[PDB]
Structure formats: C-alpha cells, structure tokens
Write an enzyme that holds these catalytic residues in place. Structure first.
Site, PDB file in Angstrom:
ATOM      1  N   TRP A  80     -56.533 -22.975  39.521  1.00  0.00           N
ATOM      2  CA  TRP A  80     -55.300 -22.288  39.160  1.00  0.00           C
ATOM      3  C   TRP A  80     -54.935 -21.180  40.131  1.00  0.00           C
ATOM      4  O   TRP A  80     -53.805 -20.684  40.077  1.00  0.00           O
ATOM      5  CB  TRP A  80     -55.396 -21.672  37.753  1.00  0.00           C
ATOM      6  CG  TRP A  80     -56.036 -22.543  36.748  1.00  0.00           C
ATOM      7  CD1 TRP A  80     -57.307 -22.447  36.265  1.00  0.00           C
ATOM      8  CD2 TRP A  80     -55.444 -23.666  36.106  1.00  0.00           C
ATOM      9  NE1 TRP A  80     -57.542 -23.437  35.352  1.00  0.00           N
ATOM     10  CE2 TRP A  80     -56.414 -24.204  35.239  1.00  0.00           C
ATOM     11  CE3 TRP A  80     -54.184 -24.275  36.182  1.00  0.00           C
ATOM     12  CZ2 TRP A  80     -56.170 -25.315  34.451  1.00  0.00           C
ATOM     13  CZ3 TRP A  80     -53.939 -25.375  35.402  1.00  0.00           C
ATOM     14  CH2 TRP A  80     -54.930 -25.886  34.544  1.00  0.00           C
ATOM     15  N   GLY A 115     -49.105 -16.817  32.148  1.00  0.00           N
ATOM     16  CA  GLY A 115     -48.901 -15.552  31.469  1.00  0.00           C
ATOM     17  C   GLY A 115     -47.842 -14.664  32.072  1.00  0.00           C
ATOM     18  O   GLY A 115     -47.890 -13.443  31.886  1.00  0.00           O
ATOM     19  N   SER A 196     -47.609 -23.376  28.615  1.00  0.00           N
ATOM     20  CA  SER A 196     -47.912 -21.944  28.345  1.00  0.00           C
ATOM     21  C   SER A 196     -46.705 -21.059  28.530  1.00  0.00           C
ATOM     22  O   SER A 196     -45.671 -21.279  27.854  1.00  0.00           O
ATOM     23  CB  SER A 196     -49.073 -21.505  29.229  1.00  0.00           C
ATOM     24  OG  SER A 196     -49.821 -20.478  28.583  1.00  0.00           O
ATOM     25  N   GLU A 323     -57.256 -24.865  22.137  1.00  0.00           N
ATOM     26  CA  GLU A 323     -56.460 -23.959  22.957  1.00  0.00           C
ATOM     27  C   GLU A 323     -57.175 -22.636  23.182  1.00  0.00           C
ATOM     28  O   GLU A 323     -56.994 -22.007  24.231  1.00  0.00           O
ATOM     29  CB  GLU A 323     -55.100 -23.703  22.301  1.00  0.00           C
ATOM     30  CG  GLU A 323     -54.191 -24.913  22.251  1.00  0.00           C
ATOM     31  CD  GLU A 323     -53.380 -25.094  23.513  1.00  0.00           C
ATOM     32  OE1 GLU A 323     -53.570 -24.304  24.462  1.00  0.00           O
ATOM     33  OE2 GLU A 323     -52.572 -26.050  23.561  1.00  0.00           O
ATOM     34  N   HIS A 436     -57.039 -25.412  26.730  1.00  0.00           N
ATOM     35  CA  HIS A 436     -55.722 -25.006  27.197  1.00  0.00           C
ATOM     36  C   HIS A 436     -55.540 -25.353  28.667  1.00  0.00           C
ATOM     37  O   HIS A 436     -56.377 -25.009  29.507  1.00  0.00           O
ATOM     38  CB  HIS A 436     -55.566 -23.503  26.974  1.00  0.00           C
ATOM     39  CG  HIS A 436     -54.289 -22.928  27.494  1.00  0.00           C
ATOM     40  ND1 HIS A 436     -53.086 -23.077  26.839  1.00  0.00           N
ATOM     41  CD2 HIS A 436     -54.037 -22.152  28.574  1.00  0.00           C
ATOM     42  CE1 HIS A 436     -52.141 -22.444  27.509  1.00  0.00           C
ATOM     43  NE2 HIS A 436     -52.693 -21.871  28.564  1.00  0.00           N
TER      44      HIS A 436
END
Ligand SMILES: *[C@@H]1O[C@H](CO)[C@@H](O[C@@H]2O[C@H](CO)[C@@H](O)[C@H](O)[C@H]2NC(C)=O)[C@H](O)[C@H]1NC(C)=O
Ligand SMILES: *[C@@H]1O[C@H](CO)[C@@H](O)[C@H](O)[C@H]1NC(C)=O
Ligand SMILES: *[C@@H]1O[C@H](CO)[C@@H](O)[C@H](O)[C@H]1NC(C)=O
Ligand SMILES: *[C@@H]1O[C@H](CO)[C@@H](O)[C@H](O)[C@H]1NC(C)=O
Ligand SMILES: *[C@@H]1O[C@H](CO)[C@@H](O)[C@H](O)[C@H]1NC(C)=O
Ligand SMILES: *[C@@H]1O[C@H](CO)[C@@H](O)[C@H](O)[C@H]1NC(C)=O
Ligand SMILES: *[C@@H]1O[C@H](CO)[C@@H](O)[C@H](O)[C@H]1NC(C)=O
Ligand SMILES: [Cl-]
Length: 527
Positions: A80, A115, A196, A323, A436
């Site tokens: 990520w 986020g 998300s 999750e 998740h």
C-alpha cells in the site's frame, strides 16, 4: 503510434499484452494545474492546453503523504505504500482502453482509499488492464491530494476551504465527461467504484450537486460517509487546522495570513505535524478528511440522506468478513502480525480504550457484554476474535447496511455483498481472516493471471466478481449470467437480503450481523 486528442492537447499511450490480447494504456494524464505555491490548499484549477504530445507512458507522481513504516520489508503493509515519487505536483489520472478500440464502452472510475491521508492510483492492486481486457470496459483512476494538503479547512475561506481532494476527484470526473468519448467511452454510462475512504468518497459524490451529472452508478466497498471515521464536523475541522498552525509556528490573527504561513512551509514539515492535530490516536483516525464546507457538502451527510437529497440511481455495496483485524496490529496491546494474538479479558478492554477513547466506563462494559456471549465458553481466541468484530462491525458493516437501508428506502435498487474468501497469497497471518482491503485484487481480476500462484477456485471467483461488477456498471444489475448462476437480489429494508462471495458457495442470506448491528444503531448512541 498510439495518439488521442484531448481538449487540452494530445496524449500518447502504450500497447500492453494481456491474456493474448492488447489493452491500450494512457498513464499519467494531467487533469488540473499542479497545486503548487499559491495554489496549495486551494481547489484544483483547470488545465489550459499543451500543444505538444504528452507521453502518458509512466505512472505519475503520488501526492505528498506519510508512509506506513511499521513493518519494513513486509509485503502486507508495503503493497500500500506509494510506488512513485511523492510531490505536490500529483493531479494526474490513468486510462485503460480495450483493444480493438471500443465505440461506446462503459467507464469504471476507481477512487482509492487510505483514510484520506494516504493512497495512490498506481498501486499494483488497482491495475485496470484486466478489467479493460476481460470485460471490454474503460477503467479510469486519478490521484487526489490527501492529508492536510487535501482537506485542511477554514470553512468559507477560498484560500483553504476544505474538501480539495474531493474536488480533485470531481474535476477528474469532469475530465472523463469532456474527453472519454475520444477514447471510445460513453460519458452517459460511468460507474464510480472505490474502497474505504474511496468508497466514502463515492458516497459523498452521491450527495454533492456538482457531481450529480458526472457519473451514472456507484459501487462502495468497505466504506460510506456514515462510517464513524468518514466525516469531521466543521467545528472540529477548524480546531485541527489551527492546531497544525501552532505546531508549525503559523498562528496569526487573520486566517489568510495563517494560510500564507503554511504555504511556504516545506511539505515534509506539514506531514510531520499532521498526526498531532488530535490527541490520539486510533489506527483508524482521519486527522484531515471531508467536512461540511458549504460547497461540495452543503450539510451534514446523514441529514441529506435522511431527507432524500441525493442522486437516485443503482448502488452496489458490501463489506468483508474480517474488516477489523487489520487495525488491531497497529496499537492494540497483545496483537502481532507474528503471533497468534491470543489476548485476555484485560487486554480486550484495554484494546477497547484504544478504539473508544471518549466512551464512558459503562459504555465499554456494554460493548464487552454484547460481544462475550461465547458459543464455546472456553475457546482462547474468543477475546481476540471478539475485538476484531467490534472494530469491524462498528466501523464498516453496520454503517454500510445502515447506508444501504436508508438509500434503498427511496426507490432505487441496491445490491449488498459479503466477501468471505481469504486470499491464498495473503501475507498476513491466518488469525486476521478476510482482511479489509483484500477484496480489491479480486475486483481488479489479479487472480486471472495464471502465473502468480493463485488457485483455480480463486480465478473462478475473481472472474465472477469482475463480471458482476462490470455488468452492474453496464446494466445496473450485477447479474453474472442468466443461467447457472445465483441471482443477486435487491437489498430492501424488509428482508435485507445480500449475496455472499467465496469460492465454496455463493448463497443468499438475510439480516447480516443483525444482532450485532442492533447494538451499534439503537443502544451505543445512548451511552
Ligand atoms: C444480464 O446480463 C446479460 C449478459 O450476461 C445481459 O444480456 C445482454 O448481453 C448482450 C451481449 O451478449 C447484449 O447485446 C444485450 O443488449 C444484453 N441485454 C440487454 C438487456 O441489454 C443483460 O443486459 C443482463 N440482464 C439484466 C436483466 O440485467
Ligand atoms: C500495438 O503496438 C504498436 C503501437 O505503436 C503497433 O505497431 C501495433 O500494431 C499495436 N497493436 C498490436 C496488436 O500490436
Ligand atoms: C516523448 O515526448 C518527447 C517530447 O516531450 C518527444 O521528443 C519524444 O519523441 C517522445 N517519445 C517517444 C515518441 O518515444
Ligand atoms: C452512446 O450511448 C448513448 C446512450 O447510452 C447514446 O445517446 C450515444 O449516442 C451513444 N454514442 C455512440 C453510439 O457513439
Ligand atoms: C482544540 O485543540 C487543542 C489541542 O491542543 C485542545 O486542547 C482543545 O480542547 C481543542 N478544542 C476543541 C476540540 O474544541
Ligand atoms: C506477541 O505477543 C505478546 C503477548 O503479549 C506481545 O506482548 C508481543 O508484543 C507480541 N509480539 C512480539 C513480537 O512478541
Ligand atoms: C508458482 O510460482 C510462480 C509464481 O510467480 C510460477 O511461475 C510457478 O509456475 C507457480 N508454480 C510452482 C509450482 O512454482
Ligand atoms: Cl432527486
């Protein structure tokens, strides 16, 4: 030579060989003026024209952001991390076109999560080449600014109004409207999908009038604006932008002088102070995210949903089975990526304090008692599985079903899914389950590449998900095939049926986690 004439110039791309065919890719088309210097913290300004040929041949820069350095060398967390250089010069997008060139292809626009603090479209799990190749759709993804440089808010002030990252996404949707016909796409058949914070972004585009005409349908994976982490009130958003001014030495009497001070701070000094704008500290916190700016979002989002003031179209929504587990390794005592993470009753309530810092002691007891009616009163994993489902139900599953209930109540067909398959290549331990973010590689069809050790069951299931996603984009119904397929029924407030996704068996279930969600909807707001 691969060349396409946009309204701001002409782009040239590449031929990619995918599954014995070819897919044309245009990587890194700029869609806005680089928000540098005076344009930092401002809404994206439109590009003019280039009069040259832009070699859209490599992924562009990722937006300035902090990096997840908790587990150096670990693929599970670094997959990520951004895989291009970081720069405020980052408003570019990617376009994947099936070959031979289509004529009116449906467009999937991907919005990444992270986020609202991290993320980039150039990740390997967001590669749109197989979706273009296997379902003959056009795939588009953009980068939008995250952190304070995307969501710093002084409400009402054009120098830093808030929601800039959302406007970055929106202007990229405007680029698709204006230019995707030159690539073979249908501007009148565009489906946004994301995960998300990206899924939360998609749900916000359903409310924002400025986005109403820039897409057709929406897919939300593990996210929606009614999630606890999704939106900050404009009162609290303003406190944190002034706190960050204090950490930077930028506190002034006039707001525009405060912004002028932070415009000359080096980007690495803004990022390094972002985590402190709030005392602490959930691994799920969003320090700078969407706010009621009075422009992109004219009121609190749950109000416009209850009032039916949203775009009316078909949605596709769903969540994963585990999750919550991804977030317990980022601060909860006794949890580890290298342990089996068996925790005690005490470690469980200390874990609750980490994720519920402002809840009374009575409130933490109620959560504990609702999640400790053991089926096997003496199973060790009891407490560590309980806390994962607490985080999971509270932050994703219950808000997602609450969104789909309230959305479906205004007459549009909604489809809900439950993703139950754990990836056979998943680098995290088995106790973390179906985590998740690990449905994404099945949505983008990565298991269709038979040379990366995936199982044949996984390619079958991924090919099915790819088809259902593409068909919902094209027809508003995630039908896979007319025969020899499980029909996916509409989510309604009465029966609340959903389709489960896994290699074993896709069945049709009802009232997902109803007993758990009843606590978070109808009791927890009272403590
Ligand atoms: C169900 O999905 C099927 C495809 O699996 C869709 O069927 C048609 O597909 C052909 C191409 O093979 C097109 O020429 C037709 O136009 C498609 N049908 C329609 C109505 O456009 C079909 O659209 C889906 N059906 C429903 C009810 O969603
Ligand atoms: C893809 O590569 C080049 C593009 O410049 C072209 O010569 C070729 O014909 C294209 N198509 C295929 C199928 O190779
Ligand atoms: C890339 O663009 C430059 C100018 O920006 C051009 O000179 C060059 O030929 C292009 N690369 C090709 C055509 O491979
Ligand atoms: C694409 O489809 C739309 C309707 O979905 C239609 O109005 C438009 O004319 C089509 N464009 C083509 C076929 O080039
Ligand atoms: C504003 O931020 C400071 C952080 O230093 C905090 O002490 C204060 O209580 C905050 N006010 C709010 C959140 O209303
Ligand atoms: C493994 O579990 C123990 C049990 O409390 C915990 O303290 C520790 O931090 C975990 N990780 C490692 C690397 O020991
Ligand atoms: C699994 O490993 C690689 C995947 O990168 C692949 O080339 C190989 O053929 C697969 N099978 C075996 C038995 O290694
Ligand atoms: Cl309406």
């Amino acid at each position: 030579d691969i060349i396409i004439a946009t309204k701001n110039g002409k782009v040239r791309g590449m031929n990619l060989t995918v599954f014995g065919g070819t897919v044309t890719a245009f990587l890194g088309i700029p869609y806005a003026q680089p928000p540098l210097g005076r344009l930092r913290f401002k809404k994206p300004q439109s590009l003019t024209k280039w009069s040259d040929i832009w070699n859209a041949t490599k992924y562009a820069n990722s937006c300035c952001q902090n990096i997840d350095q908790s587990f150096p060398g670990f693929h599970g967390s670094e997959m990520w991390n951004p895989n291009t250089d970081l720069s405020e010069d980052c408003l570019y997008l990617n376009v994947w076109i099936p070959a031979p060139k289509p004529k009116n292809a449906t467009v999937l626009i991907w919005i990444y999560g992270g986020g609202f603090q991290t993320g980039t479209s150039s990740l390997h799990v967001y590669d749109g080449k197989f979706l273009a190749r296997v379902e003959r759709v056009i795939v588009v993804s953009m980068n939008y600014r995250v952190g304070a440089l995307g969501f710093l808010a002084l409400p009402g002030n054009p120098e830093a109004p808030g929601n800039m990252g959302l406007f970055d996404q929106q202007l990229a949707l405007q680029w698709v409207q204006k230019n995707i016909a030159a690539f073979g796409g249908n501007p009148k058949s565009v489906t946004l999908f994301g995960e998300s914070a990206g899924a939360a972004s998609v749900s916000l585009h359903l409310l924002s009038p400025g986005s109403h005409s820039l897409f057709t349908r929406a897919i939300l994976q593990s996210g929606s604006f009614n999630a606890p982490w999704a939106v900050t009130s404009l009162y609290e958003a303003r406190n944190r932008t002034l706190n960050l001014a204090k950490l930077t030495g930028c506190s002034r009497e006039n707001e525009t002088e405060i912004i002028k001070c932070l415009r000359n701070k080096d980007p690495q000094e803004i990022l390094l102070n972002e985590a402190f704008v709030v005392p602490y500290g959930t691994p799920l916190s969003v320090n700078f995210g969407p706010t009621v700016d009075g422009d992109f979002l004219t009121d609190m989002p749950d109000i416009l949903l209850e009032l039916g003031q949203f775009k009316k179209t078909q949605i596709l929504v769903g969540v994963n089975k585990d999750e919550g587990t991804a977030f317990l390794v980022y601060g909860a005592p006794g949890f580890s990526k290298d342990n089996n993470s068996i925790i005690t009753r005490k470690e469980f309530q200390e874990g609750l304090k980490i994720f519920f810092p402002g809840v009374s002691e009575f409130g933490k007891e109620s959560i504990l008692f609702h999640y400790t009616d053991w089926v096997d009163d003496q199973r060790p994993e009891n407490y560590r599985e309980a806390l994962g489902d607490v985080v999971g139900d509270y932050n994703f599953i219950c808000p997602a079903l609450e969104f789909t209930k309230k959305f479906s109540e205004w007459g549009n067909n909604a489809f809900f899914y439950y993703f139950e398959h754990r990836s056979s290549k998943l680098p995290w331990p088995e106790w973390m389950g179906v985590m998740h973010g690990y449905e994404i590689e099945f949505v983008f069809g990565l298991p269709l590449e038979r040379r990366d050790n995936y199982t044949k069951a996984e390619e079958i299931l991924s090919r099915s998900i790819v088809k259902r996603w593409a068909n919902f984009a094209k027809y508003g119904n995630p039908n896979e095939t007319q025969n020899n397929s499980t029909s996916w029924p509409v989510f309604k407030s009465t029966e609340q049926k959903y389709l489960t996704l896994n290699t074993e068996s896709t069945r049709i279930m009802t009232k997902l986690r109803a007993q758990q969600c009843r606590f978070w909807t109808s009791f927890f707001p009272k403590v």
